[PDB]
């Protein structure tokens, strides 16, 4: 039939079939298990960087993000050239990869399904205010929205504004969620 899906084996079967490579000695012992790094090491670390920036005018992070991140030892795959973008009382930053899913893995963690969605990839570049609003984040009309499309090797993190009511908190500050680092959420005080 017209426009129909190609017949395909279950994806689990196709993925494990590809893992053909192992039987040819092309995959080192413990290799994919080692990478499965993804679950434990790559982690929204980004919160630690934000809390440090908030309490240490380190806030180095905005001029040489790579150097700042390297101080914590958090450079890594898909996170080798880092730029932090600062929210201000007149500016809200948001990150996407419209072309695929590019994300600062080591400090944000692997991207979530929603960030990889065609909905986010298509819409946030053109209607970021509506997208954020739908997601539960109301950006005040007096604030400019700036969308960073991750199209090359720069990997971004948002430095969100520090909310009122957190004065004097300990680096407690690390209310900085994955969504805050991507730029779709604002840090919330309980």
């Amino acid at each position: 039939t017209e426009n129909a899906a190609p017949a395909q084996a279950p994806v689990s079967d196709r993925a494990w079939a590809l893992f053909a490579l192992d039987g040819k000695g092309l995959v080192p012992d413990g290799y994919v298990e080692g990478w499965k790094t993804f679950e434990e090491d790559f982690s929204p670390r980004g919160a630690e960087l934000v809390a440090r920036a908030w309490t240490d005018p380190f806030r180095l992070l905005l001029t040489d993000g790579t150097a700042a991140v390297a101080q914590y030892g958090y450079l890594g795959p898909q996170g080798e050239y880092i730029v932090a973008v600062e929210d201000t009382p007149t500016l809200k930053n948001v990150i996407v990869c419209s072309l695929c899913a590019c994300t600062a893995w080591p400090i944000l963690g692997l991207p979530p399904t929603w960030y990889k969605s065609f909905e986010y990839r298509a819409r946030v570049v053109r209607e970021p205010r509506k997208v954020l609003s739908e997601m539960g984040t109301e950006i005040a009309s007096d604030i400019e929205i700036r969308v960073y499309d991750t199209t090359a090797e720069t990997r971004y993190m948002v430095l969100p504004q520090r909310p009122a009511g957190t004065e004097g908190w300990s680096q407690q500050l690390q209310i900085v969620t994955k969504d805050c680092l991507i730029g779709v959420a604002i840090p919330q005080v309980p």
Binding site: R14, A17, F19, L26, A122, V125, R126, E127, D149, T150
Partner: protein, 211 residues
């Protein structure tokens, strides 16, 4: 490549399937999902069989309907598999034998790619640039929404990388270029039909020209 993957600005999609800070569950929602990335790194770092850019391009080369119906991690299973076949490391026969059924792959490339341009300009922060009004059938890291548009330099990278339009096809002539954070007004990109302020695109030097 003006493929269906170039989604920025496409209209008609519904709501993003997420509300802020909602539980997104585990990193991997199935036992195979770590494989595409793991096996990509085997190919890139251990075998030296292809670049990360080739992985992006082979996914772009999925038949368009196939791309549109395939979940993210599955696209990379298909892409990495396709590269292993194209590079002569695996055969489709053995993949389908091991899978116990059909394992359709991405379509062959219709472009040999292009070299890094010899003639480019070193731009400075604050300079106005235009995105070269060029059409590239192979891999390119310029989303169509900025083609021929004018914006201002916010950043020039302090590192340089191979030109994707070359290394994405495994060519020997990708050289190295810095990239530029180019800031466009939302209205430069989408006229009156946007609710945004600005959009910053990270563009290779060879995609740009003085305004």
């Amino acid at each position: 490549m003006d493929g269906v993957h170039d989604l920025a600005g496409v209209q008609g999609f519904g709501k993003v399937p997420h509300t802020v800070n909602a539980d997104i569950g585990p990193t991997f929602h199935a036992e195979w999902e770590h494989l595409p990335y793991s096996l990509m790194f085997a190919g890139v770092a251990e075998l030296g069989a292809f670049s990360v850019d080739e992985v992006r391009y082979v996914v772009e080369r999925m038949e368009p309907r196939h791309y549109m119906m395939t979940p993210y991690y599955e696209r990379y299973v298909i892409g990495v598999a396709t590269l292993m076949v194209e590079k002569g490391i695996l055969t489709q026969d053995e993949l389908e034998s091991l899978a116990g059924g059909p394992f359709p792959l991405s379509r062959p490339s219709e472009s040999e790619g292009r070299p890094a341009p010899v003639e480019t300009t070193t731009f400075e922060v604050g300079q106005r640039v235009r995105v070269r009004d060029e059409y590239v059938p192979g891999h390119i890291r310029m989303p169509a929404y900025c083609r021929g548009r004018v914006g201002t330099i916010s950043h020039r990278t302090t590192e340089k990388w191979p030109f994707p339009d070359a290394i994405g096809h495994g060519r020997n002539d990708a050289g190295e270029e810095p990239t530029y954070h180019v800031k466009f007004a939302a209205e430069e990109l989408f006229g009156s039909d946007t609710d945004g302020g600005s959009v910053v695109v990270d563009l290779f030097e060879g995609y740009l020209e003085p305004a």
